Structure formats: C-alpha cells, structure tokens
C-alpha cells in the first residue's frame, strides 16, 4: 500500500514601495519614414508595415509579479 | 490501496504602495509618413498598415500581478 | 546754352515656353508641433508664432520679370 | 555751349524652353518638433517661432529675369 | 564747347533648353527637433526660432537672368 | 573745345542645352536635434536658432547669368 502526503507552506511579502513616481516620457518614430517603390513583382504572400508600430508604455506603479506552481503525479 | 493528501497553504501579500504617480507621457509616430507606389504586380495575398498602430500605454496604478497552478494526476 | 538728348531703344523678347508643367507638391509642417511653458515672467512685448506659417508655392507658368528704370538730373 | 547725345540699343532674346517641367517635391519640417521651457524670466522684447514658417517653393516654368538700369546726371 | 556721344549696340540671346526637366526632391528638417529650458534669466532682447525655416526649392525651368546698367556723369 | 565718343557693341550668345535633367535630391536635417539648457544668465540681446533653417535647392534648367555696366564720367 502507499502513504503519500504534500505539505507546501509560504507567508512571503513581495512589496514596493514608492514615494512619488514621476515625470516619465516616450517618444517613438519622432522623425519621418518614406518608403518609395516601381516595378515590384511578388508571387507570394507579402505582409507589409510603415510607420509607428506596437510601441508600449507599461507603467505599474506596482508590477509586483508572483508565480507558483505544483503538479504532483503517480503511475 | 492507495493513501494521498495534498495541503497547499499561502498566506501571502503582494502589495504596492506609491505616494503619486505622475506625468506619464508617450508620443509614437509623431512624424510623418509616406508611401508611393508604382507598377506593383502580386498574385498571392497582401496586408498593409501604415501609420500609428497597436500603441499602448499601459499604466496600472497597481499591476500587481499574481499566479498559481495546481495539477495531480492518476493513473 | 544747354542742348541734351535722350534716346533710349528696345526691342527685346524675354520668352518662356514650356510644353508641360506639371506635378509639383509641397508639404511643410507635416509632423508634430508641441510647446510646453510653466512659470514664465515677461516684463516686455512678447510674440509668439506656432505650426505652419507663410508658406508660399509660387509656381508661376511664366515667371518672366522684366525691369526698367531710367533717372535724369539737371542743376 | 554743351551738346550731349545718348542712344542706348538693344534686340536681346532671354529665352528658356522646357519639353516637360515634371515631379517637383519639398517636405521641409517633416520630423517633430517640441519645446519645453520652466522659470524663464525675460526683462526685455521677445519674439518666438516654432513649426514650419517662411518656406517657398518657387517653380517659374519660365523665370527669365532681365533688368536694366539708366542715370544721366549734370551739374 | 562740349560735345557728347554715347552709341551702346546690343544684339545677345541668353538661352536655356531641356528636353526633360524631372524628379527633383527637397526634404529639409526630416528628423526631429526638442529644446528643453529650465531657469533662464534674460534681461534684453531675445529672439528665437525652433523647426523648418527659410526652406526654399527655386527651380527656375528658365532662370536666365540678365542685367545691364549705365551712369554718365557731367560736371 | 571737346569731342568725345563712345561705341560699344555685342552679338554674344551664352547658351546651355541640355537633353534631361534628372532627379536631384536633397536632406538637410536628417537627423535629430536636441538642445538642454539649465541656469542660464544673460544681460544682452539673443538670437537662436534650432532646426532645419535657410536651405536652398536652386535647380535653374538654364541658370545663364549675363552681367555688363558702362560708366563715363567728366569733370
């Protein structure tokens, strides 16, 4: 016969503290994009971008992340 | 004849504090864009984008993010 | 006695052909203007100007200037 | 006595052909401009421009300038 | 006595063809431009300018300029 | 007694053909321009300047300049 037994346990704090968060900025594709084009010849899928494209600005005042996992298996 | 216990515990405490956030700025494509185009010949799918696009400014005043997975298999 | 003669004479033929003017652009001012100002004390005239200012696109089909000018003194 | 002869002559042909004046292009400012400014204290005149100002985009097809000029002085 | 002669003679033909005049381009202040200013104390005059100015694309098709002038002077 | 005479006399023929005149481009400012300042003290006139400024693109077809002058002066 099998006795099995699992105790997992944490009280952990993950903390930030921040007196003042100030004053950020983000200028992306400040300048000028030109894009000229003749005579193109594609036989096959084509994907195109110009200009500004998937720009963040993730700010967390926290962004305090935590992760856990437990997988537990038998046969 | 089988035995099996499973005891997860947390007590945990994902915090964060500010005292002000402030003055967040983002400016994407702020220029200027331009495209010409001539005598183009495609015999297969297109996709186009020009000018701003996708642009987040994500700011959680918290983001605290947190996770947990538990799996426990038998066979 | 005075005796004084003027004969000025012109025939001239300031010309200008063109068969065909075509296709002139002009795009000033195509991106971003931003003027941020906080506590500022002026004791004195002030002028401000901001975007897009006296901009001209003269295209003259002809353009053709021709100048005289002709001055006689006597004391 | 005095006896004074002018005569001035001319026949002059300033001449300009084109076929075909094409495609004239002018992006002056294309790209972004910001101006930030905190405790500026002036005691006298100010002036100020910010953008895109003063651009020309002359195109004489012609633009024959031809100019002539003529004094005759006596005491 | 005094006697005074004065015969200019002129015939001259300034020219200027093309077959084809094409595709000319002008882009001034493409990219981007900030001034930041903190804790200025002027006491006179100021005069400022920020961005594209002054930009120009003369294309005289022609721009055959001629000049002449003439003095005669008695005393 | 006096006797004075003057006879100037031209046929010339400043010429320039050309069979095509083609794409001519031109990029003053490119690229970035960032200017800080902090504390600044002035007790006198100012001029600034920031950016793309006074750029020419003179593309004269002809551009066939022809100058003369005549003075003739008595005492």
Same mark, same amino acid.
């Given at each position: 016969?099998?006795?099995?037994?699992? /105790?997992? +346990?944490?009280?952990?704090? +993950?903390?930030?503290?921040?007196?003042?968060?100030? !004053?950020?900025?983000? /200028?992306?594709?400040?300048?000028? +994009?030109? +894009?000229?084009?003749?005579?193109?010849?594609?036989?096959?899928?084509?994907?195109? /971008?110009?200009?500004?494209?998937? !720009?963040?600005?993730?700010?967390?005042?926290?962004? !305090?992340? /935590?992760?856990?996992?437990?997988?537990?298996?038998?046969?």
């Amino acid at each position: 016969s099998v006795q099995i037994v699992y /105790k997992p +346990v944490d009280l952990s704090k +993950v903390t930030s503290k921040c007196g003042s968060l100030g !004053n950020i900025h983000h /200028k992306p594709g400040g300048g000028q +994009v030109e +894009v000229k084009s003749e005579k193109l010849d594609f036989k096959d899928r084509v994907q195109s /971008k110009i200009g500004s494209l998937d !720009n963040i600005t993730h700010v967390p005042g926290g962004g !305090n992340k /935590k992760i856990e996992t437990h997988k537990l298996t038998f046969r």
